[PDB]
Amino acid sequence: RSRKESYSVYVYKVLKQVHPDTGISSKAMGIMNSFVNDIFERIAGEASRLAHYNKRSTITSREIQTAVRLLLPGELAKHAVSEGTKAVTKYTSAK
Amino acid sequence: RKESYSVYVYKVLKQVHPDTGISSKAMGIMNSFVNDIFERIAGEASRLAHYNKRSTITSREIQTAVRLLLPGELAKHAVSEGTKAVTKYTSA
Amino acid sequence: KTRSSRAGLQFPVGRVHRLLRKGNYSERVGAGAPVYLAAVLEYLTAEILELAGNAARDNKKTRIIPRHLQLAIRNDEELNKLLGRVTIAQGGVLPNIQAVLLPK
Amino acid sequence: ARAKAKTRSSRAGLQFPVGRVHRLLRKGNYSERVGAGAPVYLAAVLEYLTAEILELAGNAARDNKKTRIIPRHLQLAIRNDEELNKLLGRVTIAQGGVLPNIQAVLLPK
Amino acid sequence: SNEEYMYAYRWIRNHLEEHTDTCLPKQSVYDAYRKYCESLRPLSTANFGKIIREIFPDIKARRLGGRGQSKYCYSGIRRKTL
Amino acid sequence: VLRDNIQGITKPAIRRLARRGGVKRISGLIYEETRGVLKVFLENVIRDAVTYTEHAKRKTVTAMDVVYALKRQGRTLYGFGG
Amino acid sequence: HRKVLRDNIQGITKPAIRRLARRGGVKRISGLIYEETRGVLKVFLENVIRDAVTYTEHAKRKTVTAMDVVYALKRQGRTLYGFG
Amino acid sequence: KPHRYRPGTVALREIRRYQKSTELLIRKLPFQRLVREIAQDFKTDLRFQSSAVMALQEASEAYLVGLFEDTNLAAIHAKRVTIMPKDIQLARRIRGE
Amino acid sequence: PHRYRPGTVALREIRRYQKSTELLIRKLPFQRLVREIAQDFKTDLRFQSSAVMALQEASEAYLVGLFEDTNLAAIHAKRVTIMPKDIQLARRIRGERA
DNA sequence: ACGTTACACGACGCTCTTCCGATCTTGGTTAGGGTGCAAGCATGATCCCTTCGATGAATAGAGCCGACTGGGCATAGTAACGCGTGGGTTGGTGAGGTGGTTCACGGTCATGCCGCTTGGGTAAGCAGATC
DNA sequence: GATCTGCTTACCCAAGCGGCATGACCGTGAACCACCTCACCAACCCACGCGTTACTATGCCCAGTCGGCTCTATTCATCGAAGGGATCATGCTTGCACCCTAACCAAGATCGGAAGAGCGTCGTGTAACGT
């Protein structure tokens, strides 16, 4: 019956990990969902543009990392690049 | 061996102004403008098709993208030209 | 026989169709979308080139240069709004001196 | 298909769904193919950004002696950090209000 | 003084036509211009480049030819066939 | 039918909007200017939203349509869907 | 076989800033804006060249092409017609 | 005899009060009616889902607040405190509108 | 003497440089400036001539637009001379320095 | 002025598989006006300070020359980059079970928080001085 | 002209407290979509060749640049004035909550045809060489 997906299950998990004793209202959860969707759209669009510019037909981790470096400003870019590299290394190291 | 819009821009210029020539820097700027406007309209049409959970880009999506991007009388005239071209296309 | 002439156009609709299909804009592309896009592109190009020719004939010239393109773009409200953030290489600026700075 | 079905968000240690991000990247009209390591990287970046903004919002909500993050707290956490304010400069947050900044000239003498 | 500038302007204007594809040896054009000017003082080789840059905006200076035998060439002009 | 509702944006609204903006003193002729600016901004955004809702074969302007219309002009809105 | 460049931002001479202002439409120029126009140009160039160098680096190239600068300018909402 | 505040005190109190709150400052019903009147010029008998009106109100209030911040910055730049229509015009022109 | 009264050669230069479409910043110092600026991001990275040319055109257009906005701010401030605070206000309103 | 390694590029004809003009319910949403009620808004005094027009004073930017020098061109050398060409390793689907996920919902409860006093702490103007 | 007080009017907060009112969670369940399975080519990677180039370093020379003098047009810094605005008091006009909501429209499946994708052939431009 009009099953719509969201990030409200995962945003709550990330919030509980950071702040163990701080709930989030259903109106701020919508803002966090919109923020996640917007940042995902920005990064994916930049990655697609990067792939098209180099005539590549595949979005690898390189395209996403370059898109993150292009979009995220300064220190945020460095931190997110480190996070993504660590996550990818852990993923390929654990099958 | 790189595709470009030089020949067609020259044909259009000769259609409107049969005497005035066009330089090479101006031709490059015209090519860049054509590419940029094509990218704008195609991206708007893609977003329109994605919002309504559609998969095809028909003349309707391009028409609505033209309505969205081009301002004022430009949108009206471009929509009229596109509709005329489409109705001429389907009639053999 | 060519599809760009069956629509009574000058821009190519085969090239536009290929760019629309290989540009990853949608899974499928309708047979009437390249025609509409080619018609819109041709109309916009014709409008800008006509204005550029009119601006070049004012300078008693016979060749359209980036200066004439900038003059045509900046002197039409709709075209200026459409190409608002666009910078034209070697196009200069539209001459406009504020009335306060003129002598009296 | 005889396995325990280890989800891709568990191998990478993330909390955001790698599978859902991969599905969105595939049916998002971005490229013909999507490498296997791209959803993991994108999910990690998204999770880091969400964790940072939520940490700042929780910090700005404990100051007001509140347990529940509201839109005003997100706006306070975004408008204060320089990198976040630069990244979300054009973004409007509903019911976020504005930062309490008064010019030094309007104040009395 | 400035008579050489006018003569170079005229020679380039009615002897070279702008064309985005073809490339010409850079020394041949100057030699032909000098031969033309030896019929009545030719512009210096360091100023002929400036003049032809002023006349043609979209002109490049490529260095074509095989390895070791690379010679300079104007890119964007050709002979006016007249 | 509706007519002359821009006066519904009262002076004590344009004021207190300036006050949220951080304005101490307010001229007497700025309320009409603010009403005109609000009218033109609303006309632009509502026109975009109406084209969005007309392409969807609909007759009700959904909040998603308004969000997309605002995003088209660079004013992304968080709180109603993304 | 290379060189190091220092004290170069002041290579954007005061007459160049004056000419830029004249094309802008400025009648009188205060003597303190050259040291500020140079800084504004430096920060704008830093941003654009950072984006262009990132685009080049992703392409596994060692020379910044014109398309890289065009895309770097397009990213910041400043399109450039004339270079492809 | 009655306590009369000097000009500027209540203005500063309102500045500090309305920046601490997040509520909508334009009345909901007049703004909804204005939106309906504006939209009746593009499509006759066009219904409005009662959340797009709220989104329009939030966006319009944010736009007006940002514009008034720019207007105040322009007015202070001219050695003035009162914001004038020329300040709004200059802010909107420099923004690129 | 026949000295020009101040304020008219400025208008002559404005009319000269507004109707002319050449490049105002000298090419070689701007190329060296670009090379120095890129010296901090990655070393041993060359610049195409077209890349330097495009950077110069974009920078000149940006500075000309910024100076138009600065002149507007100066005229709004009951002045004729543009000042550093005028540039700062112009960049602040456009959304470049918060 | 005339032909080719026949490849790029596009168009025509033909299966095969998705995809829309019209309906058919189906019920969830919104605007057919109505009742009260009080709380912002209109209007009007009042006086307050700020902004706006002179008005000298400072001051520094604009012309104007006089030295002077480097950018803007053309040359070459060279280490290196980049495209072209030819061989040699890898993700989506031919898809297909298979089952953990997560999305809605009724409901129950825990507690978070929005409003009535109580009384404190803060700012802030209205009145006392004289070279 | 500013140093202190004689105190009288407008905003938070820890209480007590009510009372909603919103969020977490427990099962339902139930689609539902991520996942793990052999194959199989296009997509990508890599080695080698040269053409070309970005960056080096001479050579010329004049047009642009740097710097000091002079001067006056422009920007400050004060003074008054008066006229816009700010602030407060009354009287409401109209916004703000709940509903008889009836029409109406946004969705979830239906009738086929209409249409697009994907392969097989066939029509038009050219990287250089002679009279």
Apex CA H63: angle with CA I83 and CA D89, to 5°?
70
In a domain? residue A50: yes
Say if residues F68 and B49 touch (Cβ distance below 8 Å). Answer: no
Q: What is the C-alpha to C-alpha distance for residues A91 and D20, in angstroms, rounded to an integer?
A: 16
* CB neighbours of residue A83 within 10 Å: 21
Distances (CA, A) of I86 to E21, I69, I91: 47, 9, 9
Q: How was this structure determined?
A: cryo-EM
Evaluate if the CB of D36 falls below 7 Å from strand J: yes
Residue G83 near chain B (CB below 8 Å): yes
Instruction: Catalogue all structural domains in chain E, each as residue range(s) with its CATH number.
Output: 3-79 (1.10.10.10)
Judging by DSSP bridges, how do beta strands C28-29 and A58-59 pair with one another?
unpaired
Domains and CATH numbers, chain D: 8-87 (1.10.20.10)
CB burial string F47-72: b at 16+ within 10 A, e below: bbbbbbbbbbeeeebbbbbbbbbbbb
Q: Which of F70, H29, F72, A15 is closest to D94 using CA atoms?
A: F70
Nearest nt to the CA of E70 via C1' is: K52
Q: Put residue D8 in one of left, alpha, beta given phi > 0 → left and psi -120 to 50 → alpha.
A: alpha
- Chain C residues interacting with chain A (CB cutoff of 8 angstroms): 23-24
Distance CA H5, CA G6 (A): 60
SS3 I22: coil
What residue has its CA nearest to the C1' of J62? I6
Handedness of CA D44, A13, A25, H13 (dihedral sign): negative
> Min CA distance, D95 vs chain C (Å)?
31
Resolution value in angstroms: 3.3
To the nearest whole Å, the CA of B15 is away from the closest chain C CA by 8
The CATH number linked to F44 is 1.10.20.10
- Asked if residue B1 belongs to a domain, the reply is no
Q: Residue E79 — φ and ψ, nearest 5°?
A: -70, 145
Contact between F52 and B50 (Cβ < 8 Å): no
Strand K nucleotides within 7 Å of a protein CB? 9-12, 14, 22-24, 32-37, 43-45, 50-57, 59-61, 64-66, 72-76, 84-89, 94-97, 104-108, 115-117, 127
Q: Is residue B82 part of a domain?
A: yes
Q: Are D92 and F78 in contact (CB under 8 A)?
A: yes
Dihedrals phi, psi of I20, to nearest 5 degrees: -115, 140
Query: By residue range, what is the domain housing residue B80?
Result: 6-90
Task: Give the nearest partner residue to B52 out of F48, F56, F72, using CB atoms.
Answer: F56
* Residue F48 located in a structural domain: yes
State whether F66 and H52 contact (CB < 8 Å).
yes
Q: Considering the domain boundaries, does residue G2 fall inside one?
A: no
Residue H60: its chain F contacts at CB < 8 A? 38, 41-42, 45
- Cα(F34)–Cα(H91) distance, integer angstroms: 12
D27-57 b/e (C-beta count within 10 Å ≥ 16 → b) = ebbbbeebbebbbbbbbbbbbbbbbbbbbbb
Residue F19 lies in a domain: no
Residue C93 at interface with chain G, using a CB cutoff of 8 Å? yes
Which other chains touch chain E, taking contact as 3+ CB pairs less than 8 Å apart?
B
User: B39: domain CATH number?
Assistant: 1.10.20.10
In this structure, CATH architecture of domain I8-93: Orthogonal Bundle (1.10)
Residues 3-62 of G with CB under 7 A from strand K: 3, 13-16, 28
Q: Report the 3 state secondary structure along H48-67.
A: ECCCHHHHHHHHHHHHHHHH
Range of the domain at F65: 27-82
The structural domain count of chain B equals 1
Classify E23 as helix, strand or coil: strand
3-state secondary structure C18-52: HHHHHCCCCCEECCCHHHHHHHHHHHHHHHHHHHH
Shortest distance between the Cα of A26 and any Cα of chain D, in A, equals 8
Count of domains observed in chain F = 1
| Single-letter amino acid code for the residue at E66 | G
Q: What is the maximum span of chain H, computed from C-alpha positions, in angstroms?
A: 58
| C-alpha span between E4 and E42 (Å, rounded) | 6
Q: Which CATH number fits domain H9-95: 2.30.30.100, 1.10.20.10, 1.10.1740.10, 3.20.20.140?
A: 1.10.20.10
CB contact under 8 A, F78 and A31: yes
Q: How far is CA D27 from the centre of its chain?
A: 22
Quick check: is F2 in a domain? no
To the nearest whole Å, the CA of I58 is away from the closest chain C CA by 7
